[PDB]
Structures are given as C-alpha cells and as structure tokens.
Design an enzyme around this catalytic site. Sequence first.
Site, mmCIF file in Angstrom:
data_model
loop_
_atom_site.group_PDB
_atom_site.id
_atom_site.type_symbol
_atom_site.label_atom_id
_atom_site.label_comp_id
_atom_site.label_asym_id
_atom_site.label_seq_id
_atom_site.Cartn_x
_atom_site.Cartn_y
_atom_site.Cartn_z
ATOM 1 C CB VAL A 27 -0.978 0.018 1.190
ATOM 2 C CG1 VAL A 27 -2.113 -0.964 0.959
ATOM 3 C CG2 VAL A 27 -0.258 -0.295 2.487
ATOM 4 C CB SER A 29 7.397 2.293 -0.535
ATOM 5 N N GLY A 31 10.293 3.162 5.217
ATOM 6 C CA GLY A 31 9.884 1.773 5.281
ATOM 7 C C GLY A 31 8.852 1.491 4.209
ATOM 8 C CB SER A 32 7.936 -1.416 2.269
ATOM 9 O OG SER A 32 9.169 -1.127 1.635
ATOM 10 C CB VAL A 33 3.084 0.350 4.662
ATOM 11 C CG1 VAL A 33 1.822 -0.028 5.429
ATOM 12 C CG2 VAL A 33 3.954 1.271 5.494
ATOM 13 C CG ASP A 163 2.432 9.428 10.226
ATOM 14 O OD1 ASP A 163 2.564 8.244 10.607
ATOM 15 O OD2 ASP A 163 2.283 9.746 9.019
HETATM 16 MG MG LIG Z 1 1.921 11.462 7.830
#
Ligand SMILES: [Mg+2]
Length: 346
Positions: A27, A29, A31-33, A163
Amino acid sequence: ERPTFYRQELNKTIWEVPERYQNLSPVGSYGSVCAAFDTKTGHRVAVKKLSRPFQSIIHAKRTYRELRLLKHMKHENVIGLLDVFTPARSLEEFNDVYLVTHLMGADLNNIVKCQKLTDDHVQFLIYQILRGLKYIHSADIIHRDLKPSNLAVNEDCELKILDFGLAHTDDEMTGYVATRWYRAPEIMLNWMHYNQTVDIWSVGCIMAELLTGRTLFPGTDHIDQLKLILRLVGTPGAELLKKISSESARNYIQSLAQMPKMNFANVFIGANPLAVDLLEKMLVLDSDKRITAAQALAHAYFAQYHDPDDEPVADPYDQSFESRDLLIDEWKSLTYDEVISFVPPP
Ligand SMILES: [Mg+2]
Ligand SMILES: COC(=O)Nc1cccc(NC(=O)OC)c1
Ligand SMILES: [Cl-]
Ligand SMILES: [Cl-]
Ligand SMILES: [Cl-]
Ligand SMILES: [Cl-]
Ligand SMILES: [Cl-]
C-alpha cells in the site's frame, strides 16, 4: 512461544512474518507498508517493515525512539502498537524490525475537502484532538507535526492522532507546501527553544480550516507565511522580542511596519462566537500565553462533550536516552530488548 514465520517476495521486497498475518497487499513505501488481515484479533492492519533501521548511529537511535514512543501510547485518540516482531532467533542475527498498527482509512483531508461540516462536527473533531493532546503532553511528549494528513477519521467522526515527529529535512519545508503551513512561527524560523505549546498553534490552524474550508496560512515560503501570520495576530511587542535569541531575527522583525491584531469575528464570518473566542486563545504569537490542552477542554465551546472524569493522563515516560551517547550495536541491543519484551493489548 515463538510463532511460525513464512516468507514471500512482494514488489521486490522480502516479507517474513508470523502465520497470523494473511493476504498481504502493498500500500505504500522510511519503510514499506502492506495491508493484511490479522487472524488473531480480527482486525485489518498495517504492517511496516523498517528500511535500514541500523545503518548509522542516527538511524539506530531513531529506530529505538520510534519503538519506545509507540509502545507507550495507550489512549482512544492516539495510534497505538498492536504488535512488533523480528524473524531473528537471536541478537546475533537481528537485522529487521516490523511494526503492526490498525489500518487507517480516511484522514481529515478526505473529509475537510469533501464534506459539509456542521459546527457540531467541528466541536467533536477538535475535542478529540485536544483529548489526545492532554494525554500526550502529560508525558512531556511533543508531537511537532500535527496537520490534517496526520489525523485519521472514520465514518462515525472518531479521530486518532498519528505520525509523531521523530525528527523533516530542509527541502521538505521549502516553498508552497502543506508540510509547513501548520507550524508555529517560533519553530518555523528557529526563534527560540520550543516546547509543547507548538502543538496548540497547529490545532488552531486545523480548527480554522475546518470552519472555513480553506488553509489559514498557505505561505509560498517561510517569509510570505510569516507575513500572513503577523497580519492576523499582530506584530510582536517588546516582551516577546526579549525572548527571541537570534539578533538577526530580532533585527528582521523590527524592520517590519507594526500591525494590530485583527478582529477575528470579521475573519471567521458567521462562526459560533465561542469558536471565535477559542481561536483567539490558541493563535497567540507568544507561546507562553497560549491556552493549554487541559485548559481548552474546559472551554464552553465543548460543553456538549467535556467529561472531566473521562479525559485521562499518561503514565510517566522516561526520555533520558535522548541525551545518551551510544554505539550502533548498543542502540541495536536496546531495540532488540524492546521487541522481545512487548506485551500485546487485551
Ligand atoms: Mg503522515
Ligand atoms: C477570506 O475570507 C474571510 O475573511 N473569511 C472566510 C473565507 C471563506 C470561508 C469562511 N467561512 C467561515 O468563517 O465559516 C465560519 C470565512
Ligand atoms: Cl490504535
Ligand atoms: Cl532479522
Ligand atoms: Cl496535511
Ligand atoms: Cl511602523
Ligand atoms: Cl518510561
């Protein structure tokens, strides 16, 4: 005790995760998610694989910082940590860290630009931000990056803060960019040592935008943005000038023609008078004089939602590691200990 892991390559990346996580789908990148279904809890989740978490002392300390912060946050209006794992069987082969959180759908942008908000909606959304901030600030944590894309909202108008600012580049803050429009002036221009009051400035910018549908201070660069701010709230007096440590910055401010604070009822035309009053108490140039999150929750604008028996504070948070000087492998070992000691929520 250790779960069984399985491996798979998804979009040029190897993912090795416990069997409980199924139907992984990329979904984004840092890090990648991947989105996934967690068969243990029944939730749709976001799984983030950290990119090069221990490549430098700076990066290793940032990895530890993020994990410590996410493990501490336990509040309805703040993102929490559902799981953290590594496929490593020992510290000697430890290299990869994976973080698991609830999968978030829309953010406040996906509503502010596309919905018609009543005053009741604004009350409830800002109430929840302030309720989360009272909790965050009680642990002497500063978010530092509050803006609409960092606020998750669902169909029932329920909100979570995410975040956290883990310490943005110069390029990212340059020009006509939303990354800077919500920042307090004393941190945008490095006027002084900042504190948790910077987050209240951000809440004021967000609340104004919910009321008007428009960005409050959409500056084309740092100086254009400062001019928009001073036109609304007034140029500083000698009292605040005393607190600005840079001589050049003080000299720059004194080069500007003086301006009075504007009438906020003639800016936020038609708004609830109690909303106008609260905005005047958040958007104060001198950070010492801004309202706090705990004080704002008791403001009459939130009378419909305020419950002083259901606005909790946080457990104490030990940040002494921030002033500590360690080697990469020592930061890595501290992170490993925090991964293996994680205890999931109920
Ligand atoms: Mg954010
Ligand atoms: C530049 O125009 C203004 O001064 N004020 C403005 C603009 C657009 C919308 C609103 N709405 C509002 O206040 O809803 C409560 C107010
Ligand atoms: Cl959560
Ligand atoms: Cl590993
Ligand atoms: Cl944003
Ligand atoms: Cl003047
Ligand atoms: Cl602690």
